[PDB]
Design a protein around this ligand. Structure first.
Ligand SMILES: CC(=O)S[C@@H]1CC2=CC(=O)CC[C@]2(C)[C@H]2CC[C@@]3(C)[C@@H](CC[C@@]34CCC(=O)O4)[C@H]12
Length: 233
């Protein structure tokens, strides 16, 4: 479980940053996003337990939790590489207070910056990160339901009990509390994402084909309460 998870973690992804307008940063981040999602897809097909449920539900869980996954991962890199001092999007794209301003996404950057700070305080470990990331993959579901709602519950309770064994009643509360707080930020990041998209017509912010399909899928119908977040507290 832990062994497999650490082995299947994605490889380093570069932003391909070419040196600085607001349009640039966001488009670069969106392209960065499209690139990381490719790694997520590959990651998911080899994820223990997940690769079992029907592809429908598999594509579905990936389309509802993509923001949780990428932002938590950003938080991890920022913690591992800069001790949660800056926002480490990629080796060639590390954000500072200024870059945080250029992208016109300051409070939103400060928001995730705060998550990563909690990584330091809690001294989050790599194996806790890996199991916590899978739980975020299984954190959001369509209000209506998945094809195999029973196969999902089993994998989720499995990974949950997996974090318990990993922790063994101390940081488990802290870790799950953090996962719960991730949803709060993701909501903010998502709505900002939907605005930039429904206005990119003028903002000149480009969106990779991957994002376009996910957003135009999540935003359209699942804007309302069609996405039920699973909380631990
Ligand atoms: C401070 C943050 O959390 S940025 C957030 C997470 C992330 C981390 C990465 O490492 C790789 C890149 C991503 C996936 C961003 C890509 C761009 C997103 C979808 C942003 C939130 C809002 C935005 C800005 C413009 C837009 O169209 O929507 C994403």
């Amino acid at each position: 479980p832990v062994m497999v998870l650490e082995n299947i973690e994605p490889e380093i992804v570069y932003a391909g940053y070419d040196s600085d307008t607001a349009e640039n940063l966001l488009s670069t981040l969106n392209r960065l996003a499209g690139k990381q999602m490719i790694q997520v897809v590959k990651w998911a097909k080899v994820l223990p337990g997940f690769k079992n449920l029907p592809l429908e539900d598999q594509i579905t869980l990936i389309q509802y939790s993509w923001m949780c996954l990428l932002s938590f991962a950003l938080s991890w890199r920022s913690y591992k590489h800069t001790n949660s001092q800056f926002l480490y999007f990629a080796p060639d794209l590390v954000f500072n207070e200024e870059k945080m301003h250029q992208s016109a996404m300051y409070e939103l950057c400060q928001g995730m910056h705060q998550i990563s700070l909690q990584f330091v305080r809690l001294q989050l470990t790599f194996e806790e990160y890996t199991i916590m990331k899978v739980l975020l993959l299984l954190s959001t579901i369509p209000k209506d339901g998945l094809k195999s709602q029973a196969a999902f519950e089993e994998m989720r309770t499995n990974y949950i009990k997996e974090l318990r064994k990993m922790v063994t009643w101390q940081r488990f509360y802290q870790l799950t509390k953090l996962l719960d707080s991730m949803h709060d930020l993701v909501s903010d990041l998502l709505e900002f994402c939907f605005y930039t998209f429904r206005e990119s017509h003028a903002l000149k912010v480009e969106f990779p084909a991957m994002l376009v399909e996910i957003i135009s899928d999540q935003l359209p119908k699942v804007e309302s309460g069609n996405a039920k977040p699973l909380y631990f507290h």
